């Protein structure tokens, strides 16, 4: 092995893995078939569906315990001192489980932690009760020829929100551990998790736990997802998946809080989408009979690899379930999860739809007058108002730099840090030189963080460092191409410095090449210098060669920084065609703000090609193109007012579509209430000069001449257009029937269903409209709650008319047959015609029009 002597003093391994061997993740994925070959867990997995036990606690609890039995009074009710006052009974509930045909018992350990004990005086007993606890279940289960798995629960103090720091928690996981693997575990097992945080916290100390004692064992993860949809904390089950699958985890699934039912879309999603395997323990009440139903869906219909049972469900639970289940043949994992990263609360991809993955940089204290003024006031309320506002813009991803000369880089973290760790929708990418500011920043964000920068600037040890925190933490990585040579400013310095890093990353320390984020540099093109001025087209050549060369990795860049020296004007146009010609030669994301660009659509066709010039250096005797550009703007200073005054002198429908394509709020409703005054009607605004501008807009945005945060511009305008018109609207009937409506999970465009909200609603029939994102489960709530005449759905992103397919094959197998409703752009006639295959009921609506004389045909016209 090359790799096994390559490494730096600055390599840390033991948690993440390294490149080679059995190391959980390597460069091609989770490393299945090396860990199968190490583990007989794995191997069993990969050959049959496992039936794990069911409750513990609650078969304790049908047992008549006595203080005594507990050790005394102070003892009373804690579950895991029974592992040291009364092992037989333990051991008895899992000879129970292992004769009902349980191949995988539980250690009774779940409180086996340092906090949660010490509500009962025995905090320093985690290692010994845990150690006792597997030892019990390796005596019950030896003779059955069974897996133990070692398990531990969430505790009860929420890392998230404040409740315990990271450095306790790691401790109180990472001594349990140390218990179950000196006691013979098979595996370990992190169950009924709430809070996403604490399962990168536990994940890493029970690593650490391995690497002390000496001994690997498979590492199983299980959440808990509440009846509302959720963990605990907010962490839907993409956020879940997202900030498992880059984690050293070699199965993940869920257990606890509801039944089978509401589980099914979560244990779906896994089974569909996760590379590791899938375990799934329902609680219950439900019958050993329904839950062998469940589960036999669960491992022939969606490939679920390990099924049990949780509180609620006893042996009998668990002998239906292992009749139901012998002989499966298990389906295959998936082998790639498309690259993606995570807040407390939702996944965002990396690889964003139509569209760059944008950053947002005014959380940058270097960047930001703002910011730093906010930072050193501790103004909190403006920070947060600040990564709004970045958000609401457009923002996939919030960079966040704290640094500064004169103060403390640490302190500033941990006072920020907790605080965006529950507001943010969003992920950060923490922007640091420190590893220790980004070990830091590690121990507080939920999910799936990014870290902006490995390089070589000041050696290999630290960009081994980062790396090895990326590759433990799961983190997504920006490499940015500095060496001990200096910043690579031609092309071929760009490529050989990402060449060496790439290989680094990839081979010596298994990061994923979707993790990588290549910034090959951004420098200035207007100080100048002959030195400065094929600098924008180096990056850009650079980056088509090594997107053919590395296919996988993903491309960012700072933006603005092209265009510094300039007028504001200037810098906006010189960014945007920069950033729409690095989008041309391989750019997946760009960390830039609203404020420095502006749609292509609204550059004139001279500056537009002047910025070409400028980019790619087209210097003549003829023509200096920095100078022509610059030029351009001093003849022209007059065009904002040309715009105004043409904009305001438009005729006034004209002018309200403008509004829209151009995003002016400011004057609106004045406009709209002058159109009403003349006599126009609501319903003739909104299907006439309103969409009329967004149909515009989607074709410039489709025609790559238009970016987000202007569509969202746009967006805005035309919902206040709608809220403003939507009291002077003219009703037209009375009761004639009810909708439940929504916009599926995943999709947030809901401005053709609210149109259809209104048209419907002013025709005669209740609208209950459940809004954007709407689970399936909240959908059929709202069903039963108003029994109405139909269901409609909204979807206009593709991967929605998905979500419609499995909303219907949901709703067929609970016996809904009730009409359903869909429609939205992403949507053709054809297909849902195609979809009468699952659901005889369902019908396509073109139009808000034809929404309407749907519910008229389906009511009889009421
Ligand atoms: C506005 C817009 C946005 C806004 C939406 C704001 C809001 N709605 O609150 C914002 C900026 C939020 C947005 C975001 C994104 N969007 Co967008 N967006 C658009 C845009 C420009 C206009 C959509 C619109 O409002 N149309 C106007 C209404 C009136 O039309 P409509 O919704 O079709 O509805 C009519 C019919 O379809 C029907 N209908 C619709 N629903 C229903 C339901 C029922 C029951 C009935 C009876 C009828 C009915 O009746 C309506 C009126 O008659 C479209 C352009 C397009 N569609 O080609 C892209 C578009 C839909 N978006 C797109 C994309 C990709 C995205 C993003 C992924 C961008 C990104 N960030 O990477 C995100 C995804 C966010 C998410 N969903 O999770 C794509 C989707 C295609 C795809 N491959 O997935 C489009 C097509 C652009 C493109 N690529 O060309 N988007
Ligand atoms: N393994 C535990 C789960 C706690 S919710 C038990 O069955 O009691
Ligand atoms: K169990
Ligand atoms: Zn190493
Ligand atoms: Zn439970």
């Known amino acids: 092995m090359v790799e096994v002597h390559a490494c730096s003093p600055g390599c840390r391994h033991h948690l993440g893995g390294a490149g080679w061997g059995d190391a959980p993740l390597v460069r091609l994925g989770y490393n299945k078939e090396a860990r199968a070959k190490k583990f007989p867990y794995l191997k069993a997995l990969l050959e049959r569906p496992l039936v794990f036990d069911g409750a513990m606690g609650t078969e304790l609890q049908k047992r008549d315990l006595t203080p005594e039995d507990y050790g005394g009074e102070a003892y009373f009710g804690c579950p895991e001192v029974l592992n040291r006052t009364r092992p037989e009974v333990v051991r008895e509930i899992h000879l129970a489980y292992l004769e009902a045909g349980a191949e995988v018992i539980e250690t009774n350990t779940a409180g086996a932690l340092r906090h949660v004990l010490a509500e009962y005086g025995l905090a320093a007993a985690a290692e010994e009760l845990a150690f006792l606890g597997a030892r019990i279940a390796r005596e019950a289960a030896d003779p059955h020829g069974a897996f133990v798995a ?4 969430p505790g009860t103090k929420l890392v998230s929100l404040g409740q315990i720091s990271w450095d306790a928690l790691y401790r109180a996981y990472k001594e349990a551990a140390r218990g179950l693997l000196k006691g013979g575990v098979d595996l370990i097992l992190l169950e009924t998790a709430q809070d996403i945080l604490q399962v990168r916290c536990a994940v890493l100390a029970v690593r650490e736990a391995m690497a002390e004692v000496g001994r690997e064992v498979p590492l199983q993860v299980q959440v808990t997802f509440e009846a509302t949809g959720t963990m605990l904390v907010g962490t839907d089950e993409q956020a879940a998946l997202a900030a498992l699958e880059s984690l050293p985890v070699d199965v993940v699934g869920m257990n606890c809080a509801t039944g089978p039912d509401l589980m099914d879309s979560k244990v779906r999603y896994f089974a569909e989408h996760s590379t590791r395997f899938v375990s799934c323990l329902p609680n219950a009440d439900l019958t050993p009979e329904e839950l062998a139903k469940w589960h036999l869906k669960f491992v022939a219909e969606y490939g679920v690899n390990a099924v049990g049972g949780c509180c609620g469900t006893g042996p009998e639970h668990i002998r239906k379930v292992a009749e139901a289940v012998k002989g499966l043949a298990p389906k295959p994992r998936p082998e790639s999860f498309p690259p993606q990263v995570a807040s407390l609360y939702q996944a965002v991809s990396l690889k964003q739809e139509a569209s760059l993955f944008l950053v947002g940089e005014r959380l940058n204290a270097t960047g930001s007058k703002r910011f730093r003024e906010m930072l050193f006031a501790r103004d909190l309320e403006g920070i947060l108002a600040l990564a709004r506002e970045q958000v609401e813009e457009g923002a996939h991803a919030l960079d966040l730099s704290v640094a500064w000369t004169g103060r403390d880089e640490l302190e500033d973290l941990r006072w920020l840090l907790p605080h965006l760790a529950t507001a943010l929708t969003v992920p950060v990418m923490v922007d640091s030189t420190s590893p220790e500011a980004m070990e830091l920043a590690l121990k507080y964000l939920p999910g799936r963080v990014l870290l902006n920068s490995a390089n070589l600037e000041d050696g290999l040890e630290r960009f081994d460092r980062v790396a090895s925190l990326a590759k433990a933490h799961g983190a997504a990585l920006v490499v940015l191409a500095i060496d001990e040579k200096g910043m690579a400013k031609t092309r071929e310095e760009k490529v050989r410095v990402a060449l060496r890093m790439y290989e680094r990353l990839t081979e010596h320390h298994g990061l994923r090449p979707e993790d990588l984020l290549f910034d090959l540099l951004t420098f200035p093109i207007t ?11 180096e990056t850009l050549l650079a980056m088509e060669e090594l997107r053919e060369r590395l296919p996988g990795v993903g491309f960012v860049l700072g933006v603005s920084n092209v265009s510094f020296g300039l007028k504001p004007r200037a810098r906006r146009v010189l960014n945007s065609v920069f950033l729409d010609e690095a989008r041309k030669r391989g750019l ?275």
């Open 150 to 153: 070692g398990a531990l629960g």
């Open 588 to 862: 997946t994301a760009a960390i830039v703000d609203a404020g420095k660009i502006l749609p292509i659509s609204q550059i004139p066709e001279e500056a537009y090609a002047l910025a070409l010039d400028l980019i790619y250096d087209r210097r003549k005797e003829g023509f200096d193109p920095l100078l022509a550009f610059m030029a351009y703007f001093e003849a022209h200073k007059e065009a904002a007012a040309k715009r105004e005054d043409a904009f305001l002198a438009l005729p006034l429908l004209e002018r309200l579509k403008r509004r829209v394509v151009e995003g002016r709020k400011q004057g609106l409703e004045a406009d709209l209430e002058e159109a009403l005054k003349a006599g126009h009607k609501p319903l003739d605004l909104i299907n006439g000069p309103l969409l009329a501008g967004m149909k515009e807009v989607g074709d410039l945005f489709g025609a790559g001449k238009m970016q987000l945060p202007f569509v969202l511009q746009a967006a805005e305008v035309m919902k206040r257009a709608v809220a403003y018109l939507e009291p002077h609207m003219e009703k037209k009937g009375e009761g004639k029937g009810t909708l439940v409506l929504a916009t599926v999970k995943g999709d947030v465009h809901d401005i053709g269903k609210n149109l259809v909200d209104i048209i419907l609603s002013n025709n005669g029939y209740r609208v209950v409209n459940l809004g954007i994102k709407v689970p399936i489960e909240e959908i059929l709530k709202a069903v039963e709650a108003h029994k109405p005449h139909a269901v409609g759905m909204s979807g206009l992103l593709v991967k929605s008319t998905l979500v419609m397919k499995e909303n219907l094959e949901y709703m067929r197998d609970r016996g809904y047959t009730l009409p359903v409703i869909l429609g939205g752009a992403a949507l053709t006639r054809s297909y849902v015609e195609e979809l009468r295959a699952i659901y005889p009921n369902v019908y396509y609506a073109e139009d808000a029009f034809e929404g309407l004389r749907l519910m008229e045909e389906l009511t009889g016209h009421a």
């Open 527 to 537: 100080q100048g210098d002959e030195e400065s001025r094929p600098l924008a087209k």
